[PDB]
Amino acid sequence: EQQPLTLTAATTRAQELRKQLNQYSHEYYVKDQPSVEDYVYDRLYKELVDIETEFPDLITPDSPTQRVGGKVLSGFEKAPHDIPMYSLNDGFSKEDIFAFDERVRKAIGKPVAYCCELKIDGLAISLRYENGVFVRGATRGDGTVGENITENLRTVRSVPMRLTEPISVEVRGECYMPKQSFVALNEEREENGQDIFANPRNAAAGSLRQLDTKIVAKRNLNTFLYTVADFGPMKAKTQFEALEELSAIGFRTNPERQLCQSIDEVWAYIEEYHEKRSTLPYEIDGIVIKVNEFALQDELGFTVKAPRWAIAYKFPPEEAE
Ligand SMILES: NC(=O)c1ccc[n+]([C@@H]2O[C@H](COP(=O)(O)O)[C@@H](O)[C@H]2O)c1
Numbered sequence: 001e002q003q004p005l006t007l008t009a010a011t012t013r014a015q016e017l018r019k020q021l022n023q024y025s026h027e028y029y030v031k032d033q034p035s036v037e038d039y040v041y042d043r044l045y046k047e048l049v050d051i052e053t054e055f056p057d058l059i060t061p062d063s064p065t066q067r068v069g070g071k072v073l074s075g076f077e078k079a080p081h082d083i084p085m086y087s088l089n090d091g092f093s094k095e096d097i098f099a100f101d102e103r104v105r106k107a108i109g110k111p112v113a114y115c116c117e118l119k120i121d122g123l124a125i126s127l128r129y130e131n132g133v134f135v136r137g138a139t140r141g142d143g144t145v146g147e148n149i150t151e152n153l154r155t156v157r158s159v160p161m162r163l164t165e166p167i168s169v170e171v172r173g174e175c176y177m178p179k180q181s182f183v184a185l186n187e188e189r190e191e192n193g194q195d196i197f198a199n200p201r202n203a204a205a206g207s208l209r210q211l212d213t214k215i216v217a218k219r220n221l222n223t224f225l226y227t228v229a230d231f232g233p234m235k236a237k238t239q240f241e242a243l244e245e246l247s248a249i250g251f252r253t254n255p256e257r258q259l260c261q262s263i264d265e266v267w268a269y270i271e272e273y274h275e276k277r278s279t280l281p282y283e284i285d286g287i288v289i290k291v292n293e294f295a296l297q298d299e300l301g302f303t304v305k306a307p308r309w310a311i312a313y314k315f316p317p318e319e320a321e
Pocket residue numbers: 024025026027028029034035036037038039041042045064157
């Protein structure tokens with residue numbers, strides 16, 4: 001009647017299972033191409049649960065079991081941002097975007113490539129990893145202090161609990177509610193006699209500021225991550241490389257990005273995705289245009305409030321189209 005695993009064997013087996021299950025969940029949710037069928041995932045998941053039941057000391061923050069929800073907070077702790085979560089300078093016309101490029105070329109002394117990306121209209125978040133393990137999820141708040149919503153963000157399946165390398169990084173992006181889930185949620189709320197959400201941003205914000213993680217788990221949320229606070233531990237030397245690297249290490253990144261070799265290509269991208277806007281399952285409020293090379297971003301620097309190497313081109317609001 002002796003238990004088959006010693007503590008030491010269970011510890012090693014738990015490590016293997018968490019790594020394997022995190023890999024399979026990433027394939028399933030983020031890559032959308034699972035290498036194993038659900039019953040194989042479920043079988044390994046149950047094995048891990050049984051180990052954690054027998055040996056509770058083996059429950060770690062990177063464990064897949066820590067997603068399910070159940071935890072209920074009394075309130076959110078403040079989450080300071082040591083590196084500010086800044087807002088970009090804005091543009092609205094062709095004139096503004098070509099003027100941006102003129103100012104960039106004035107500073108750099110040559111034409112420059114731009115990394116062009118969709119400005120995702122959700123709740124801005126920062127995800128902190130230490131030794132490749134998810135340790136803190138935070139809202140932007142005012143950009144200097146937000147709310148610690150780590151447990152809520154664990155329920156968001158696209159958020160990785162571990163990375164493919166044991167680096168310490170602070171990763172910035174957006175958490176949003178897909179449009180199709182937003183409209184379904186409002187109908188559900190209508191039927192439950194609850195106030196409806198004005199728009200998907202409010203629904204994502206409301207969802208992530210619930211204290212009971214079980215309720216947050218019921219909501220459908222997703223993420224796109226696009227940069228980090230400090231590139232030290234990273235190998236990327238350009239914004240486009242940065243996006244590929246974040247993707248490689250486990251983050252969901254937006255597939256619509258494009259590296260533009262001229263301002264004309266930048267303008268054509270803006271036009272392309274203004275048209276495509278309606279066809280996307282997530283809301284965007286514009287296009288972000290960034291000087292691609294980090295050496296050049298470093299040369300341009302920042303103003304008192306914003307980068308001099310990036311601009312946000314704003315569309316009309318989602319309600320208006
Ligand atoms: N086939 C896979 O690799 C894989 C990975 C994660 C979740 N799932 C499925 O998603 C559902 C929810 O599972 P989780 O709560 O662990 O994310 C289950 O039905 C599970 O089978 C499948």
